[PDB]
């Protein structure tokens, strides 16, 4: 009388014929996510095939389909980004809850459609107060994760996030959107952080808020970390790694919470070492090295290799406005230790490229006897997008993990470095930054 | 095996035959093997050549996983196609395509002192119509100055050239002012996002029109090939396709021991497996063990 | 998809839309009882808000199992959709089997009769070659290598003339 | 034999990838 | 069904070379 | 001689230049090279011996490099 696989056979027979309309496939996807059918991939694929192939789409069926795609955890870029046609064409015809669901579920998959996000931000910046704050958090999430660095929406959303008290889930979505934006406006993040005081109804709430606070590098909140140490069973390993990483970047000392988050990722790595991305293994190594927590003996060395792999892959695919910056900083660092002509500049630049202990290649590394001083260049991509322009938390992450390898990381940001008029002022700034961390040089 | 620099491009890659190589290398590193040192050598020519021949090993399998939007009406399939090409370029180590072709411009003509040598060295990376229009604007400025228009920017010859280059740019349909205000930046963010929200709408129209032109070329090529092929009798079609398949299979059976011939034969056997497994159950499709 | 999702049991679809499958939920405050009716089978589970947030922790990552490529299957799908448009005008050819009898053979000029019989033979040729569907998979591998050599650029795969013209106007109209 | 995998069937088959690899394994050592 | 594998790059950013519309529909309608 | 460079000469760079260019005159010859400037070269130098032209420049190096690669990619 209550049988799940028989109704899954019924839905599989439903979306296998020729004449599935929009409402039928939208209903099939909703009834799939209400039944938690992740074990059966091909039935989900039939639903996505008939959802991409369908030609009619009204507002309700498209909204329910995008809701089911986002909530079911299913990703397929072709069928999701080909739903943006019905998203743009019905963008007047969507209610604010529907427009929020549509733009959030299309921003989740990384759909690079700038006209949809531009028009949705325009509609939500004309009618600001009409949207409930969860809806403006969803539109902020969708415009932030779709590649749009829209900041008019960010300030006009932070006004509402500071005026009216929002939910924990709404504030977590707002924080994660601001972390992808890279904003670090303390006046609105601190207004959003009062919502994390009643306890988190979901573990993804506290995990995403911890990652957002860590990536903007503020602090812990004493109730996010309690929710994480209380409910780290409802986290995927790729989610719990980002939770521990956002805790360690924010400066947390609660090693019990790191034990809780590590005891759900380390059985996942020991079960399948190939299940997580190398970026996630680097985040696990940074979280395990900064907070002083421990790992198993086969996992600590594994993420010790994998952090070197992730730093090398970030080195090789450098954006070549950072490569000119590293050449500039290495030239000013060669001059700062005595170089008045060009061949000694080039021979001192070509000697700063010594190898790290874990296998990675450090661009500027100086050894005077036993003292290793590294210089880090932070171009614009690892800076905060607001006008004070402080570096992000991943910068301090790399600095604090190289400090555990024995290096004195003199971080040189490029909001200040490229404003100096001559190369001698750049050598002055590089020596002032090296003397600040290790004045023995 | 993987040669320790192929693995570094494949971490952000997501095609299957590279993802299995990453996962095999990480399974090798899990069972007590050491990660080699990344080579602190290979000066900028060999480094750029290694980039050129390592990013192609990500671009080339990543192209064949991107379905063309052939014969689709609307603006969203073309935007999906160009968005997938953007994500492939971002996973292959390329930058934003605007930034990359700008870097190619600044790399080709770092030392061209007049505007004619800039306009003749990057003739290829610009359309020949826009290059011919810039040649006629340059000769219209040289008809007044009777000197080579200096590629300096503060020279009044270059300013009188730029006041007509902006004219031919807006005449070509592209807003020069929006692009210039974006790439020169601005001070306040409340006026910088209002030029970003015009430059990126131009940019979305730009790559949408370019990917749509590529799709129109593939549509016209497929229509030409089919309208040639449907004129033939059946037996000529069958024997010429069997002959071309036999010759292209003899090209792979001629080479032995090489990796591409072996992978070619493994892919032929995988295609025959696909045909046999569809034949085993045609209403359900190929057998995928989950 | 991203790492963290923010949907489930909140502004959700409360009801189904089409008659092929009927859905109803129980909009309580803490949990929710669902019931789904699709024809002969009936299903009704009970899930919580903390059970849908565990759903998007594992990503499905749907991918297409194609014969040769997704690219080659897209080009072959287009070639078959063109061959359908040729077939749909071979479907409107007039029937010549109703003019084969000998009250049409002997009332007609001999050269016009040879021309009519050659027209019937030409229709059999055209209809037997437009339905050679096994040859489209070999035709679509002639469009593939030129296209893949176009996307194997030294600049960028997605690059084209309009983006290069805009960046050339930016590079030209700056200082030096 | 039959029903291989999913991550073995998502390989685009007749991409080049190996003539690019056969050049890059014989050009880069011959140019260093 | 199988293609000649090429290992070469395009250097220029050129027009996509739209071919001419072949005359099969007019010939078959005639 | 005539040393055609890209940047004006520095004191250690000049003595390294007369160290590297000394291996072309086939004795202990004291090259009394003259200096010229040429922004078209992207670094390096060009010796004009007034009988021969020795091209240690960078633009010639990248042209010979691209010719070598475009000669090897057609050989494979």
DSSP, residue by residue, B8-65: HHSSS---HHHHHHHHHHHHHHHTT-PPPPPPS---HHHHHHHHHHHHHHHHHHHHTT
* Structural domain that includes position F43: 1-76
Tokens for A20, please give them: 């599935």
Alpha-carbon distances of A433 from A427, C88, F46, rounded to whole Å: 10, 75, 40
Q: Is B39 on the interface with D (CB under 8 A)?
A: no
Last residue of a domain, one of A200, A229, A249: A200
Nearest to B224 among E9, E13, E22 (CB): E22
Alpha-carbon distances of A403 from A255, A360, C149, rounded to whole Å: 20, 15, 46
Alpha-carbon distances of A158 from A124, A192, B262, rounded to whole Å: 13, 9, 59
Residues A223 and A107 in one domain: no
The vertex-F12 CA angle with F9 and F18, nearest 5°, equals: 75
Q: How far is the C-alpha of B66 from the C-alpha of B81, rounded, in Å? A: 7
Last residue of a domain, one of A300, A319, A338: A319
Nearest CA in chain B to C125: B233
Tokens for B255, please give them: 């080479």
Chain-chain contact of F42 with B113 (C-beta, under 8 angstroms): no
Residues A335 and A273 in one domain: no
Q: How far is the C-alpha of F21 from the C-alpha of F43, rounded, in Å? A: 15
Tokens for A54, please give them: 């369908």
From the list A365, A388, A369, A390, the residue with the least C-alpha distance to A378 is A390
The number of distinct structural domains making up chain F is 1
Q: Is C73 on the interface with D (CB under 8 A)?
A: no
Contact in structure between B184 and C170 (CB atoms under 8 Å) = no
The Cα of A376 is separated from the nearest Cα of chain F by a number of Å equal to 28
Kindly report the backbone phi and psi dihedral angles of residue E9, in degrees, each rounded to the nearest multiple of 5, phi listed first: -115, 155
- Give A167's Cβ-side CA count (13 Å radius): 16
The Cα of F39 is separated from the nearest Cα of chain E by a number of Å equal to 26
Chain-chain contact of E19 with B124 (C-beta, under 8 angstroms): no
Q: Can you list the pairs that A319-326 forms with residues at least 24 positions away whose Cβ atoms lie under 8 Å?
A: A319/A379, A319/A381, A319/B95, A319/B99, A320/B95, A320/B103, A321/A379, A321/A380, A321/B99, A322/A377, A322/A379, A322/A381, A325/A377, A325/A379, A325/A414, A325/A417, A325/A418, A326/A363, A326/A364, A326/A377
Q: Is the dihedral of CA B147, B151, B153, B159 positive or negative?
A: positive
Range 25-84 of B in CB contact (< 8 A) with A: 26-27, 29-30, 34-38, 40, 51, 67, 74-77, 79-80, 82-84
Alpha-carbon distances of B79 from A116, A237, C107, rounded to whole Å: 11, 33, 62
Contact in structure between C163 and C155 (CB atoms under 8 Å) = no
Residues A276 and A337 in one domain: no
Chain-chain contact of B231 with E24 (C-beta, under 8 angstroms): yes
Tokens for F72, please give them: 């090897």
For chain F, give the longest Cα–Cα distance.
Answer: 46
Chain-chain contact of C89 with E16 (C-beta, under 8 angstroms): no
Q: Is it the case that chain C and chain B have 3 or more CB pairs lying under 8 Å apart?
A: yes
Q: Is the dihedral of CA B145, B148, B149, B155 positive or negative?
A: negative
Q: Is C64 on the interface with D (CB under 8 A)?
A: yes
Q: Which chains touch F (3 or more CB pairs under 8 A)?
A: A, B, D, E
Q: Residue F46 forms beta bridges with which residues?
A: F4, F55
Cα dihedral A119, A121, A127, A129, rounded to 10, equals 160
Q: How far is the C-alpha of C119 from the C-alpha of C135, rounded, in Å? A: 25
Q: Is it the case that chain A and chain E have 3 or more CB pairs lying under 8 Å apart?
A: no
Q: Can you list the pairs that A383-388 forms with residues at least 24 positions away whose Cβ atoms lie under 8 Å?
A: A383/A182, A383/A413, A383/A414, A383/A415, A384/A182, A384/A183, A384/A184, A384/A216, A385/A149, A385/A151, A385/A181, A385/A182, A385/A183, A385/B189, A386/A183, A386/A184, A386/A185, A386/B189, A387/B189, A388/A184
Tokens for A313, please give them: 């892959």
Q: How far is the C-alpha of A206 from the C-alpha of A196, rounded, in Å? A: 8
Last residue of a domain, one of A185, A200, A215: A200
Residues A353 and A375 in one domain: yes
Chain-chain contact of B127 with C161 (C-beta, under 8 angstroms): yes
Q: How far is the C-alpha of A244 from the C-alpha of A251, rounded, in Å? A: 11
Alpha-carbon distances of B249 from A28, B178, B240, C123, C136, rounded to whole Å: 45, 53, 14, 34, 18
Residues A250 and A325 in one domain: no
Cβ partners under 8 Å of residue A151, min gap 6: A181, A183, A385, B189, B190, B193
Q: Is B67 on the interface with D (CB under 8 A)?
A: no
Q: How far is the C-alpha of B13 from the C-alpha of B57, rounded, in Å? A: 10
Q: How far is the C-alpha of B234 from the C-alpha of B242, rounded, in Å? A: 12
Chain-chain contact of D12 with C71 (C-beta, under 8 angstroms): yes
Start-to-end CA distance of chain A, whole Å, equals 78
Q: Is C166 on the interface with E (CB under 8 A)?
A: no
Chain F residues in contact with E8 (beta carbon < 8 A): 73
Tokens for A322, please give them: 């950072």
Q: How far is the C-alpha of A60 from the C-alpha of A66, rounded, in Å? A: 10
Phi and psi based region of residue A119 (left: phi greater than 0; alpha: psi -120 to 50; beta: remaining): alpha
The number of distinct structural domains making up chain A is 4
Q: Is A232 helix (H, G, I), strand (E, B) or coil?
A: coil
Resolution for this PDB entry, in angstroms: 3.6
Contact in structure between C20 and A27 (CB atoms under 8 Å) = yes
* Structural domain that includes position A10: 4-82
The Cα of F68 is separated from the nearest Cα of chain E by a number of Å equal to 16
Alpha-carbon distances of B245 from B139, B274, C135, C142, D14, rounded to whole Å: 54, 18, 11, 12, 13
- Method by which the model was determined: cryo-EM
Tokens for B16, please give them: 């299957």
The vertex-C62 CA angle with C56 and C68, nearest 5°, equals: 165
Range 35-74 of F in CB contact (< 8 A) with E: 73
Nearest CA in chain C to B237: C135
Residues A312 and A344 in one domain: no
Cβ partners under 8 Å of residue A78, min gap 6: A52, B67, B80, B84
Residues A325 and A440 in one domain: yes
The Cα of F76 is separated from the nearest Cα of chain E by a number of Å equal to 9
Q: How far is the C-alpha of A201 from the C-alpha of C142, rounded, in Å? A: 57
Q: Is D29 on the interface with B (CB under 8 A)?
A: no
Nearest to C65 among D10, D14, D15 (CB): D10
Q: What is the SS3 assignment for C51-119?
A: HHCCHHHCCCCCCCCCCCCHHHHHHHHHHHHHHHHHHHHHCCCCCCHHHCCHHHHCCCCHHHHHHHHHH
- Give A263's Cβ-side CA count (13 Å radius): 12
Chain E residues in contact with D22 (beta carbon < 8 A): 7
Which residue carries 């992730």 as its tokens?
Answer: A310
Q: Is it the case that chain D and chain B have 3 or more CB pairs lying under 8 Å apart?
A: yes
Q: Is B227 on the interface with A (CB under 8 A)?
A: no
Neighbours of B159 (CB within 10 A): 12
Q: Concatenated DSSP letters for D1-14?
A: --S--STTTTS-SS
The Cα of C12 is separated from the nearest Cα of chain A by a number of Å equal to 7
From the list B158, B151, B159, the residue with the least C-alpha distance to B112 is B151
Nearest to B111 among F42, F62, F69 (CB): F42
Number of H helices, E strands in chain E: 1, 0
Alpha-carbon distances of B176 from B6, B164, C105, C150, C172, rounded to whole Å: 40, 11, 74, 28, 10
Tokens for B60, please give them: 């080339």
Start-to-end CA distance of chain F, whole Å, equals 42
Q: Is it the case that chain C and chain A have 3 or more CB pairs lying under 8 Å apart?
A: yes
Number of H helices, E strands in chain F: 2, 4
The vertex-A410 CA angle with A406 and A415, nearest 5°, equals: 150
The vertex-B195 CA angle with B192 and B200, nearest 5°, equals: 120
Distance from CA of residue A323 to its chain's centroid?
Answer: 23
Cβ-Cβ pairs closer than 8 A, D with E, add up to: 13
Give the burial class of A340: count Cβ atoms within 10 A of its Cβ; 0-12 exposed, 13-18 middle, 19 or more buried: exposed
Chain E residues in contact with C154 (beta carbon < 8 A): 9-11
Nearest CA in chain C to A37: C55
Give the burial class of F18: count Cβ atoms within 10 A of its Cβ; 0-12 exposed, 13-18 middle, 19 or more buried: middle
Chain C residues in contact with E2 (beta carbon < 8 A): 68, 141
Contact in structure between B200 and A148 (CB atoms under 8 Å) = yes
Q: Is D10 on the interface with B (CB under 8 A)?
A: yes
Residues A346 and A373 in one domain: yes
């Amino acid at each position: 009388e209550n049988d799940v696989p028989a109704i899954l056979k019924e839905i599989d027979s439903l979306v296998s014929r020729e004449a599935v309309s929009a409402k039928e496939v939208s209903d099939a996807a909703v009834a799939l996510t209400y039944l938690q059918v992740k074990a059966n991939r091909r039935l989900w694929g039939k639903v996505l095939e008939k959802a991409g192939a369908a030609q009619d789409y009204d507002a309700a069926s498209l909204t329910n389909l995008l809701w089911a795609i986002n909530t079911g955890g299913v990703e397929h870029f072709k069928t999701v980004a080909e739903l943006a046609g019905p998203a743009v064409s019905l963008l007047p015809s969507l209610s604010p809850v529907q427009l929020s669901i549509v733009v959030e579920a299309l921003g989740g998959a990384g759909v690079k459609n700038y006209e949809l996000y531009n028009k949705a931000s325009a509609v939500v910046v004309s009618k600001i107060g009409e949207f409930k704050p969860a809806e403006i958090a969803r539109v902020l999430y969708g415009v932030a994760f779709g590649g749009v660095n829209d900041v008019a929406l960010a300030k006009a959303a932070g006004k509402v996030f500071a005026s009216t008290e929002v939910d924990s889930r709404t504030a977590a979505q707002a924080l994660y959107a601001l972390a992808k934006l890279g904003r670090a406006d303390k006046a609105t993040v601190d207004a959003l952080l009062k919502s994390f005081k009643k306890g988190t109804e979901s573990a993804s709430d506290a995990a995403a808020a911890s990652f957002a606070l860590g990536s903007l590098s503020f602090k812990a909140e004493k109730a996010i970390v309690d929710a994480l140490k209380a409910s780290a069973g409802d986290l995927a390993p790729a989610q719990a790694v980002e939770a521990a990483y956002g805790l360690a970047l924010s400066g947390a000392t609660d090693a019990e919470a790191f034990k809780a988050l590590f005891g759900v990722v380390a059985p996942a790595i020991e079960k399948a070492p190939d299940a997580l991305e190398v970026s996630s293994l680097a985040q696990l190594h940074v979280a395990s090295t900064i907070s002083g927590a421990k790992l198993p003996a086969a996992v600590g060395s594994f993420v010790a290799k994998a952090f070197g792999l992730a730093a090398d892959a970030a080195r090789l695919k450098r954006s070549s406005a950072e490569s000119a910056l590293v050449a500039d900083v290495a030239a000013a660092t060669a001059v700062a230790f005595g170089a008045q002509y060009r061949p000694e500049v080039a021979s001192a630049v070509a000697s700063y490229v010594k190898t790290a202990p874990d296998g990675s290649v450090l661009d500027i590394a100086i050894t005077k006897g036993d003292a290793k001083v590294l210089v880090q260049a932070v171009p614009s991509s690892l800076l905060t997008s607001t006008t004070p322009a402080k570096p992000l938390g991943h910068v301090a992450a790399y600095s604090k993990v190289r400090e555990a390898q024995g290096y004195a990381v003199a971080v040189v940001p490029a909001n200040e470095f490229e404003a100096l008029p001559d190369q001698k002022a750049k050598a002055q700034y590089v020596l002032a930054a090296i003397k600040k961390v290790a004045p023995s040089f | 095996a993987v040669s320790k620099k192929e693995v570094l491009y494949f971490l952000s890659s997501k095609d299957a035959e590279s993802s299995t190589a990453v996962k095999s290398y990480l399974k090798s590193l899990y069972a007590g093997a050491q990660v080699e040192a990344t080579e602190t050598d290979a000066s900028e020519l060999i480094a750029q050549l290694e980039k050129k021949y390592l990013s192609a090993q990500v671009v080339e399998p990543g192209v064949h996983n991107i379905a063309l939007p052939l014969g689709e009406s609307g603006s969203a399939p073309v935007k999906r196609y160009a968005a997938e090409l953007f994500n492939l370029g971002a996973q292959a180590g390329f930058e934003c395509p605007f930034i990359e072709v700008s870097k190619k411009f600044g790399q080709e003509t770092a030392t061209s002192e007049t505007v004619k040598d800039v306009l003749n060295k990057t003739k290829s990376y610009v359309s020949a119509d826009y290059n011919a229009a810039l040649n006629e604007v340059l000769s219209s400025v040289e008809a007044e100055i009777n000197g080579p228009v200096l590629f300096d920017g503060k020279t009044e010859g270059f300013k009188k050239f730029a006041a007509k280059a902006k004219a031919v740019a807006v005449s070509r349909g592209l807003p020069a002012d929006t692009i210039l205000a974006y790439c020169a930046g601005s001070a306040n963010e409340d006026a910088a996002d209002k030029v970003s929200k015009e430059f990126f709408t131009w940019f979305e129209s730009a790559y949408t029109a370019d990917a749509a032109a590529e799709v129109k070329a593939i549509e016209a090529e497929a229509a030409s090939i089919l309208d040639r092929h449907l004129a033939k009798p059946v037996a000529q079609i069958r024997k010429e396709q069997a002959s071309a398949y036999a010759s292209l299979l003899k090209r792979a059976e001629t080479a032995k021991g090489a990796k591409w011939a072996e992978k070619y034969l493994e892919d032929v056997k995988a295609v025959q497996w696909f045909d046999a497994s569809v034949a085993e159950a045609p209403a359900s499709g190929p057998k995928v063990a989950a | 998809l991203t790492t963290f999702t923010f949907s489930g049991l909140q502004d959700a679809p409360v009801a189904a839309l089409s008659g092929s499958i009927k859905l109803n939920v129980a909009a309580k405050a803490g949990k929710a009882e669902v019931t789904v009716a699709a024809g002969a089978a009936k299903a009704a589970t009970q899930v919580s808000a903390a059970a849908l947030r565990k759903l998007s922790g594992s990503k499905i990552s749907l991918a297409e199992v194609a014969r040769i490529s997704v690219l080659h299957s897209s080009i072959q799908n287009y070639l078959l959709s063109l061959s359908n448009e040729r077939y749909q005008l071979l479907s409107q050819w007039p029937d010549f089997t109703t003019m084969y009898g000998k009250d049409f053979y002997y009332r007609a000029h001999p050269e016009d009769l040879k021309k009519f019989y050659d027209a019937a033979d030409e229709y059999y040729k055209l209809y037997e070659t437009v339905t050679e569907f096994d040859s489209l998979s070999a035709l679509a591998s002639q469009v593939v290598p030129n296209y893949a050599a176009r996307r194997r650029s030294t600049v960028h795969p997605a690059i084209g003339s309009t983006v290069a013209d805009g960046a050339f106007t930016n590079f030209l109209l700056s200082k030096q | 034999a039959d029903a291989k995998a999913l991550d073995e069937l998502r390989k685009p088959k007749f991409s080049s990838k190996y003539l690019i690899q056969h050049v890059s394994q014989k050009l880069i050592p011959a140019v260093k | 069904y199988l293609a000649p594998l090429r290992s070469d790059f395009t250097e220029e950013i050129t027009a996509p070379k739209v071919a001419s519309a072949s005359n099969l529909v007019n010939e078959w309608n005639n | 001689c005539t040393v055609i460079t890209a940047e004006p000469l520095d004191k250690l760079e000049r003595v390294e230049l007369t160290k590297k260019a000394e291996k072309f005159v086939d004795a202990g010859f004291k090259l009394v090279m003259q200096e010229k400037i040429d922004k078209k070269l992207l670094g390096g130098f060009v010796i004009e011996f007034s009988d021969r032209r020795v091209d240690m420049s960078t633009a010639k190096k990248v042209e010979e490099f691209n010719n070598f690669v475009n000669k090897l990619v057609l050989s494979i």
